[PDB]
Amino acid sequence: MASKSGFSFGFELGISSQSDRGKHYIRRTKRFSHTKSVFLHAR
Amino acid sequence: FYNSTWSYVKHTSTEHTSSSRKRSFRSSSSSSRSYTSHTNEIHKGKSY
Amino acid sequence: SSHGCKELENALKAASGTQNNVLRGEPFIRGGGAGFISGLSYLELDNPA
Amino acid sequence: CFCDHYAWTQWTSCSKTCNSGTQSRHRQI
Amino acid sequence: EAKHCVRIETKKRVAKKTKVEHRCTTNKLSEKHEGSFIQGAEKSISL
């Protein structure tokens, strides 16, 4: 997210204001399961 | 004996875009959206 | 003047796979020499005959 | 086609108990 | 492949107002299939 808001006016007098906003969020998830089964009966 | 193999691929892609500009004062707003759904299936059977 | 942007992404993958592999065999012999019986009844999986 | 996408059904019970009956199995097309 | 896209523009003067908008969408699908089946039998009877 990025937001900007600023004011700049002349009147003598002059006034200026600027506000800067930046925000980032990131999420990752990984899950792994491996099952390997062997049965060997000989007679 | 029978040996059986099946392969299958599925793809979907979707995009949406909108932008608007007004002047009076002056304002703009815009949005973009992109999409994909995708599936692969592979299935096999062998008898002896 | 003022500006705003928001950006969002979400992506998901799920995968799975399985194998079942069953092999069975029961060679049976009557008569002949016990050594030939045991040697032949023993299942050569490459040559079940 | 991968015809076994449309799986074969189980066989009929045999048409007669003896002396060469027949049985059949259609697909679930 | 499917695409639908529109662009609209308007300016009016009396006061001056204008609005312009552009909208576009793309849709694509691809599906690929393959299958293989083989079967065989042997009988041998010897006397």
Author numbering:
A (entry chain D): 194 to 204, 211 to 242
B (entry chain C): 200 to 223, 225 to 248
C (entry chain C): 349 to 397
D (entry chain B): 22 to 50
E (entry chain B): 395 to 408, 411 to 443
Give excerpts from the publication.
CD59 is an abundant immuno-regulatory receptor that protects human cells from damage during complement activation. The membrane attack complex (MAC) is a human immune pore that ruptures lipid bilayers to kill cells. MAC assembles from the stepwise association of five complement proteins: C5b, C6, C7, C8, and C97. Though unable to bind soluble C8 or C9, CD59 directly engages both proteins within the nascent MAC to trap C5b8 and C5b9 assembly intermediates.
